[PDB]
Amino acid sequence: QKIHVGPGELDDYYGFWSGGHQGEVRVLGVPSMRELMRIPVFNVDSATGWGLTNESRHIMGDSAKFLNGDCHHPHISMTDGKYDGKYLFINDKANSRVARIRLDIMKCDKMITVPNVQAIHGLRLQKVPHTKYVFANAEFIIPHPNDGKVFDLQDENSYTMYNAIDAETMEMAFQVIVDGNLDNTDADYTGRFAAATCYNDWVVVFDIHAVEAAVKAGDFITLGDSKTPVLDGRKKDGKDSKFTRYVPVPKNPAGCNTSSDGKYFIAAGKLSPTCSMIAIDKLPDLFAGKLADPRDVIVGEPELGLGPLHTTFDGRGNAYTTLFIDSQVVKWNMEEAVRAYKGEKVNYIKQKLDVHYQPGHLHASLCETNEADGKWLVALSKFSKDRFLPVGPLHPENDQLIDISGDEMKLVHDGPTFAEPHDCIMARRDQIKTKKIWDRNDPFFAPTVEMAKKDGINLDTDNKVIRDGNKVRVYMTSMAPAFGVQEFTVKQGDEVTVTITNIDQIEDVSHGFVVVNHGVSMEISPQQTSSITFVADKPGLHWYYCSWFCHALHMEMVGRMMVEPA
Amino acid sequence: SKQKIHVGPGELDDYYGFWSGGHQGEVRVLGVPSMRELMRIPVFNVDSATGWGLTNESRHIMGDSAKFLNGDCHHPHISMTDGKYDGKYLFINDKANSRVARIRLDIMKCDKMITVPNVQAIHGLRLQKVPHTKYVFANAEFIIPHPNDGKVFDLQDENSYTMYNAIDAETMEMAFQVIVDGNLDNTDADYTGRFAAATCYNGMMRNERDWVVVFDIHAVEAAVKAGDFITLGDSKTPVLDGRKKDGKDSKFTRYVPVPKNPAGCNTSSDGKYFIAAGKLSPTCSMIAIDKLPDLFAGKLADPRDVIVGEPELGLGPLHTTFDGRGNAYTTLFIDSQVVKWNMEEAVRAYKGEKVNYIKQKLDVHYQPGHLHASLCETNEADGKWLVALSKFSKDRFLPVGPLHPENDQLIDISGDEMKLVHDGPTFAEPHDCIMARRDQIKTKKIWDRNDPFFAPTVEMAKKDGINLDTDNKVIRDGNKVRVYMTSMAPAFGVQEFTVKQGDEVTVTITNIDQIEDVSHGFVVVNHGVSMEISPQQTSSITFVADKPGLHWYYCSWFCHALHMEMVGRMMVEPAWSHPQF
Numbered sequence A: 001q002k003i004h005v006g007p008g009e010l011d012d013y014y015g016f017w018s019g020g021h022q023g024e025v026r027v028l029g030v031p032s033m034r035e036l037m038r039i040p041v042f043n044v045d046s047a048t049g050w051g052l053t054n055e056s057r058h059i060m061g062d063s064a065k066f067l068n069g070d071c072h073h074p075h076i077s078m079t080d081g082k083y084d085g086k087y088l089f090i091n092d093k094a095n096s097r098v099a100r101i102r103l104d105i106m107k108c109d110k111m112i113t114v115p116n117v118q119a120i121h122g123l124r125l126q127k128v129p130h131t132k133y134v135f136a137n138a139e140f141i142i143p144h145p146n147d148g149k150v151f152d153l154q155d156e157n158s159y160t161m162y163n164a165i166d167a168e169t170m171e172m173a174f175q176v177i178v179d180g181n182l183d184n185t186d187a188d189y190t191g192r193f194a195a196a197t198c199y200n201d202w203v204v205v206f207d208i209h210a211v212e213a214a215v216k217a218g219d220f221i222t223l224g225d226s227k228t229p230v231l232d233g234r235k236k237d238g239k240d241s242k243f244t245r246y247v248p249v250p251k252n253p254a255g256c257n258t259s260s261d262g263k264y265f266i267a268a269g270k271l272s273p274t275c276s277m278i279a280i281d282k283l284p285d286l287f288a289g290k291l292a293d294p295r296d297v298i299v300g301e302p303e304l305g306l307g308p309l310h311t312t313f314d315g316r317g318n319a320y321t322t323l324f325i326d327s328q329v330v331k332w333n334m335e336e337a338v339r340a341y342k343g344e345k346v347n348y349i350k351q352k353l354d355v356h357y358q359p360g361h362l363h364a365s366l367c368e369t370n371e372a373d374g375k376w377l378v379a380l381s382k383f384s385k386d387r388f389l390p391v392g393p394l395h396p397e398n399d400q401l402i403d404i405s406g407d408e409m410k411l412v413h414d415g416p417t418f419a420e421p422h423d424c425i426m427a428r429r430d431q432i433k434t435k436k437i438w439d440r441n442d443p444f445f446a447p448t449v450e451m452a453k454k455d456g457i458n459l460d461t462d463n464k465v466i467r468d469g470n471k472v473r474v475y476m477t478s479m480a481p482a483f484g485v486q487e488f489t490v491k492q493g494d495e496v497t498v499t500i501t502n503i504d505q506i507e508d509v510s511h512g513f514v515v516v517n518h519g520v521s522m523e524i525s526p527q528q529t530s531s532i533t534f535v536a537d538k539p540g541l542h543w544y545y546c547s548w549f550c551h552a553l554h555m556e557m558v559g560r561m562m563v564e565p566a
Numbered sequence B: 001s002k003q004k005i006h007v008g009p010g011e012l013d014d015y016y017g018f019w020s021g022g023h024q025g026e027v028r029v030l031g032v033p034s035m036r037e038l039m040r041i042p043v044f045n046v047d048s049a050t051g052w053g054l055t056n057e058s059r060h061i062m063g064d065s066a067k068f069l070n071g072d073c074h075h076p077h078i079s080m081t082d083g084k085y086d087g088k089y090l091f092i093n094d095k096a097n098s099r100v101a102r103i104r105l106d107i108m109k110c111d112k113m114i115t116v117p118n119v120q121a122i123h124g125l126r127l128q129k130v131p132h133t134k135y136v137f138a139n140a141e142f143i144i145p146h147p148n149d150g151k152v153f154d155l156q157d158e159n160s161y162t163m164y165n166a167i168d169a170e171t172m173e174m175a176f177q178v179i180v181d182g183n184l185d186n187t188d189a190d191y192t193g194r195f196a197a198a199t200c201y202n203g204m205m206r207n208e209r210d211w212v213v214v215f216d217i218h219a220v221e222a223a224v225k226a227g228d229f230i231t232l233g234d235s236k237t238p239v240l241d242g243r244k245k246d247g248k249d250s251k252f253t254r255y256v257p258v259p260k261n262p263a264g265c266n267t268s269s270d271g272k273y274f275i276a277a278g279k280l281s282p283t284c285s286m287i288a289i290d291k292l293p294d295l296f297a298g299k300l301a302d303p304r305d306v307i308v309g310e311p312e313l314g315l316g317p318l319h320t321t322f323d324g325r326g327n328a329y330t331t332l333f334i335d336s337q338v339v340k341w342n343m344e345e346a347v348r349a350y351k352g353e354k355v356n357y358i359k360q361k362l363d364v365h366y367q368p369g370h371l372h373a374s375l376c377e378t379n380e381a382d383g384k385w386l387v388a389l390s391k392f393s394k395d396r397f398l399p400v401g402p403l404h405p406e407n408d409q410l411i412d413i414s415g416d417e418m419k420l421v422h423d424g425p426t427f428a429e430p431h432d433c434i435m436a437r438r439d440q441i442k443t444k445k446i447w448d449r450n451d452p453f454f455a456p457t458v459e460m461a462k463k464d465g466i467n468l469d470t471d472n473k474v475i476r477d478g479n480k481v482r483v484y485m486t487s488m489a490p491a492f493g494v495q496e497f498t499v500k501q502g503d504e505v506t507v508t509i510t511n512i513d514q515i516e517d518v519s520h521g522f523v524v525v526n527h528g529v530s531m532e533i534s535p536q537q538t539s540s541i542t543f544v545a546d547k548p549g550l551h552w553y554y555c556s557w558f559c560h561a562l563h564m565e566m567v568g569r570m571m572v573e574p575a576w577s578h579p580q581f
């Protein structure tokens, strides 16, 4: 199979990598494993101005004050259990956020700080009938309220919550209080159930239908100043709530992965050298009180090796699980494991492949959908040791591409990556459709169009300087190789906003705008409007220039800001 | 020798590649020929992963410029001794905020940074080669008034100009600046230490308004030593005037006419030529370095007499590199090619001989700017690999929305025929890169406890009576709290501490693991705090505890099977329970 993409040939899949502790999302081509694009999210990007521009800071809201993020779990929206190419979602463990990326423009377009929680870690999407909810785990137990009166993590009001975000509006849908700490999560192939591993064990299963019914009936509380409906999924005096069931699983379980045939939530055993297989079609009976014991929903518990952490699927009936301690990927047959659990003498283990070294997550192509195609697998290992040239005290993660198309897994490529991406997701080339040039009506800069409208500005044509007290709003078009406004004058101390509309119509003619020695930088792609605000705190003449190479005469796309002394 | 071209699992790259991070502001370490990124080195960007731009150590190195979250990089170069890479430092420019940064290649971190005074936009940058990299040479691109205090905006005033800049590579303080006529583009240095050269351009309009300005560094140093210099503003940097005055040359410069708006300025690896790319002229011009002493001594009738070749190459020549076999390779931005040509044959053609100095034109994809052959900047130029960095990748990669990657194409030049081998997409237009042999780079896996990178922090701790290798203590000082802890996977040495709302909290962590690749992190949830601490490093970070209640901190970098348990809690007592101001 493939492996090599030579010059002039194109990759067959898109890969979306978490940016790890660096806070961005990265677009790779598969199988070449080359990085095609970086999408800034929680990081501040000098190149495009994300975190500096008004459009980006508007999307980030108050959290624009933070310059960091910590990403782990990238997932793509689905319709009828298949990737639909609309959105990517990702967590921020550092500042408790979820971000949405629009796959048509490859930019973060919405971001939410999850209220009344600390640290968004595990994250996955509803599959069916479509991605109505983003499900996100908050990892750390905190007091409620967290106002400094109570610090006791055993207090009855100290807990964490499972979080549901409306994928389309990017507002909170509901939160469910749980017992324990939440690790990973996944959803079924109907919309009724979701599940999460939780430590301090179990897999907690949520009846999303029951949660929704309670929200619609108004049977919920709110916490603090958030309107989010809050439901109590904890056990009370050994009694279950309508919303949750706690299924005992060993032991401090890690990954929680839904098989592509929709049959199983598979929890990785971590301390237990096993995975536990929860039969999704027994969950209705569990919630209806027809089973004697929550353990009755467990239909398999295969013994796999030391340190199972995560599981993925080839769509052919096999599961692939990382063994962190043994440092391998183990391929095993799920139905054979189920028969073994009944006492049948059958060997469900197909192969163990050594990986290098200490794998955490792994991801097979289309594995989160009923179209799982069994072509490529990436295992993301933490300790790369001698697999790459030494580069000082830090080391790259080793993301190893493995051909799973035949009976034998074959290691084909070691891909070093920065800041521990942790997990990734692949999509067929034909599942992703991107815009070549911006729509003038795009919501990404719609607030800036509205601001311009208030100033009487037609952004497609105008080159004007608006004076408003000590505020100056410069509006210009740009067309390589000239800025539409090549000089302007302000007073020292003025707050200057520069709004640039790139009116080039040629694909890939990106412009930039940098004000020398003012910390101002941003990108403006064809038909985009971008804006940036800074204080002209230095008298004298100050050059601005187009940063992105756009033309043979790129070096002459410059201008001058003249700042009259106070 | 037949060189490896693909690197399979378990095999290692043969060269390090140091890529400019372009408008993104970092430096990137690649493996060559795989073209895979092995590491990112934060420089002018703020890095969430390691905390560069957030930590006290990094902000101390950045100085006042730590207030900027952006940079614009182009020109990465490695220090040299006797015209060979010595693997000590890499330097790079910042065009956006007028800086030069130094990276220590043993720790792979930026260890020094300088804002060049009295200029705007540091663009071209290259290093002295011989006898070693004493100076970093850096062009400021834009003409500005002096002083630039808002009284005079006229760019044709007698005090409006830009300057060529020399920074002491070892001290990272300014050495001198030379005023020039026109705007400066690119620069390179000879193989003796006496000469450097830069491309620059700009009756009322003469035909001759494009040149390569040559600097007599020896003459510059003599004027500094004699005290024949001025200073500008509050900078003590010696400023020499290298402008032409009513046709008379200064002692410091000569202007060699070279068409037209010339771009690249590249010293051949045999030390014979400065080669300027003609850009708007479809040529390169070859300046004979061995004729420069005569030029400065007045033994030549015309500065053009130092030109010994001017090959016609194609449309839009921008940059030139060298295989060490006598061939030059030049990018053609408009024709979209790399052209291989023989330098000594171009020289013969300049004397009138009909000889075809052009050997091959290779199509590249598309619009190449800079290009770089392995070891090309040294007398060890080995003729193995060439990277051409092209601006418009068009359909060479899958579409990814309106913004596109640069196409950095790896080309095998080991034989007579250039062969295109790999298309490498890169983010934010790196522009240029530099390669070094694996054996020219020696990195540390474990920090030394006396490393200057965090020596200021060590000194601070000593004022508190702290032994950083052992102590787990919370020092209170008014409304400042200084937490000091060791860390050893999988535990922080301080797992809980209490402060008052509003306290300024500094957390200093010393990773006392002595095993390679056991990096720790430190993130305070919902406070915008994140940093790396590698084995034997001390790292520190300061933030305000502005929110009452219990606030978790955790180890971000995977360090241990029990990584998920490497957590702690900051308790913040509410302001209403303490004295009020």
Ligand code: CUA
Binding pocket: A480, A481, A510, A511, A512, A546, A547, A548, A549, A550, A551, A554, A555, A557
């Ligand atoms: Cu616009 Cu370069």
Ligand code: CUA
Binding pocket: B489, B490, B491, B519, B520, B521, B555, B556, B557, B558, B559, B560, B563, B564, B566
């Ligand atoms: Cu220390 Cu993970």
Ligand code: NA
Binding pocket: A059, A061, A110, A111, A112, A170
């Ligand atoms: Na929002």
Ligand code: NA
Binding pocket: B061, B063, B112, B113, B114, B172
């Ligand atoms: Na400095």
Ligand SMILES: [Zn+2]
Binding pocket: A072, A073, A361, A422, A423
């Ligand atoms: Zn994870």
Ligand SMILES: [Zn+2]
Binding pocket: B074, B075, B186, B370, B431, B432
């Ligand atoms: Zn350049």
